[PDB]
Design a protein around this ligand. Structure first.
Ligand SMILES: CCCCCCCCCC[N+](C)(C)[O-]
Ligand SMILES: [Ca+2]
Length: 234
């Protein structure tokens, strides 16, 4: 038991993002870059050369939320609807609708399981086929539960998680819920501050590219998505 590692996200490069996209899910999938939005609900494939998506399916009034990939299918939560959409093929088409209890904030895939956050302190673990709960951990930083756990990303042996309305990103051990790292991504929030006005225009959305290990972060309604390098601070 030691101090969580402290890191600072250093902006490597910036790319256009759409200022009308409320980013709730962000993941790489079968060579492409995907985003889930609510208000209005969409699944979109992003270009890094333009804010205009290369492909989008509109979900109407459904408030879509976190988005996970197992390499073959995309899995997409909803906020209070209790709907999980499972997408397959290229372009993705929905092949399954699944009802679940509780709220859907972030989602990622780890060790054959979907890991789900709901804005509380808990990460719950679910079977991809039918979304039955199989386990849970409480997310704890220095032994203390952390509320507001939002978009997820399963990479590098951890779960990366946004904290809603914070510029910190946690690194969580999925076996235990222990926070093993805290990333300061406040340079990203500072970077867009002169351009965003909406109260909900907050850092959210982490995706790691499988083929390159390159790490990307954005925010709701942000004009930019950022590639970051995570530097240890001592
Ligand atoms: C112009 C007003 C925009 C209202 C936005 C409401 C965002 C709800 C976000 C919920 N969650 C944290 C669950 O996504
Ligand atoms: Ca993600």
């Amino acid at each position: 038991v030691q101090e969580p590692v402290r890191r600072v996200a250093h902006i490597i490069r910036e790319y256009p993002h759409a200022t009308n996209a409320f980013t709730q899910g962000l993941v790489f999938h079968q060579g492409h870059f995907f985003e889930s939005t609510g208000h209005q609900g969409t699944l979109r494939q992003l270009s890094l050369e333009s804010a205009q998506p290369v492909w989008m399916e509109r979900l109407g009034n459904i408030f879509a939320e976190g988005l996970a990939s197992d390499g073959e299918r995309l899995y997409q939560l909803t906020w209070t609807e209790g709907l999980l959409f499972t997408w397959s093929g290229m372009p993705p088409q929905r092949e399954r609708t699944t009802r679940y209890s509780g709220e859907g904030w972030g989602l990622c895939y780890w060790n054959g399981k979907l890991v789900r956050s709901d804005g509380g302190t808990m990460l719950t673990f679910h079977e991809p086929d039918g979304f039955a709960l199989v386990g849970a951990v409480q997310v704890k930083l220095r032994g203390q539960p952390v509320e507001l756990i939002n978009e997820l990303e399963c990479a590098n042996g951890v779960i990366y998680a946004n904290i809603w309305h914070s510029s910190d990103v946690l690194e969580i051990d999925p076996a235990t819920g222990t926070v093993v790292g805290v990333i300061d991504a406040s340079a990203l929030t500072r970077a867009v501050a002169g351009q965003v006005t909406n109260p909900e225009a907050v850092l959210n959305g982490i995706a790691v590219e499988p083929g390159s290990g390159r790490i990307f972060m954005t925010g709701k309604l942000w004009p930019r998505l950022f590639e970051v390098r995570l530097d240890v601070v001592d």
